[PDB]
């Protein structure tokens, strides 16, 4: 059974694997989707929001009464917000002043203080403001693109969950790369801790194929395509890099809801699009492909994902 969780941060993870049935029709491989939308604040980032806070508590970088600050325009802010609300830390998030009002309302519902930075300055301006605030005594900055506790929580939770739920039947792991923590930690766990052969595939936007050595660019696949190679991405455990267009990411996310009853975000379609291409290769006939679906469709009502439904 599950334990009684002493606060909501302890309840991260333990997400289900769901077999894909219609998008895979005609394939002889098996595609399993890990539903990271079923987390305490409904994304994969909940794992690293909890883990980065716990890690800083253990090392003494974060003490009761201190202030947390991070620049993030995505799910990491929601993850830090619910953790800090659960564990009692004041949290400040910096982000470009063009962040949607829907995301800002979610953040403020956890009591996060929002510092908007000029929109022309983009993410660079939010990063600069956060680093300035973090330099104040009493302030802690998790640094999602550098913190080893990010991939470590995937070694400790996401990876074992995949390994154990599949009873060791996982031949391919496909993951969109934002920070790279998910793919890094799951691949480290499978290849290094369990000594298990697995073909590890990173997915990035065709419009911003930086892992493959291409130029950064603007794209609509929220949560991946950072525009740089993050320190938390360990290329030495990744076997292949696939690119996915914005349109096929959006379309595949729509098809996951329509054909499988899985309501998920745009990057879920990006990951599934790459997974389905790998799963169709004859050399994986009879093999099991696992992919991560980072969050839930409702967080995307005002985005391109729902343009076709007004």
């Amino acid at each position: 059974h599950m334990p009684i969780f002493k606060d909501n941060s302890e309840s991260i993870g333990r997400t289900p694997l769901v077999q894909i049935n219609r998008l895979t029709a005609g394939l002889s491989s098996r595609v399993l989707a890990k539903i990271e939308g079923r987390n305490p604040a409904y994304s994969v980032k909940c794992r690293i929001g909890a883990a980065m806070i716990w890690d800083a508590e253990q090392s003494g970088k974060l003490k009761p009464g201190m202030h947390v600050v991070e620049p993030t325009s995505g799910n990491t802010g929601i993850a830090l917000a619910f953790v800090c609300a659960a564990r009692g830390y004041k949290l400040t998030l910096t982000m470009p002043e063009t962040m949607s009002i829907e995301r800002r309302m979610m953040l403020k519902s956890f009591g996060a203080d929002l510092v908007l930075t000029p929109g022309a300055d983009g993410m660079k301006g939010a990063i600069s403001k956060a680093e300035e605030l973090a330099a104040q005594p009493g302030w802690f900055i998790p640094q999602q693109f550098k913190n080893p506790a990010n991939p470590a929580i995937h070694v400790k939770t996401t990876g074992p969950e995949i390994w154990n739920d599949t009873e060791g039947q996982v031949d391919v792991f496909v993951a969109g790369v934002g920070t790279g923590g998910t793919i890094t930690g799951v691949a480290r766990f499978l290849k290094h801790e369990k000594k298990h052969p697995v073909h590890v595939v990173a997915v990035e936007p065709a419009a911003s194929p930086v892992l493959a050595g291409g130029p950064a660019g603007r794209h609509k696949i929220q949560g991946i395509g950072a525009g740089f190679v993050p320190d938390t991405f360990d290329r030495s455990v990744v076997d292949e890099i696939l690119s996915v267009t914005d349109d096929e990411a959006i379309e595949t996310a729509r098809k996951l809801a329509m054909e499988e009853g899985i309501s998920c975000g745009i990057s879920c379609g990006a990951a599934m699009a790459g997974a389905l291409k790998v799963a169709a290769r004859p050399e994986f006939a009879g093999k099991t492909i696992v992919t991560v679906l980072p969050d839930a469709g409702e967080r995307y009502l005002s985005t391109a994902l729902f343009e076709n439904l007004r």
Binding site: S73, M123, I127, R218, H219
Partner: peptide
């Protein structure tokens, strides 16, 4: 359009 860590 996301770049430079935007959206994560």
């Amino acid at each position: 359009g996301f770049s430079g860590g935007d959206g994560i």
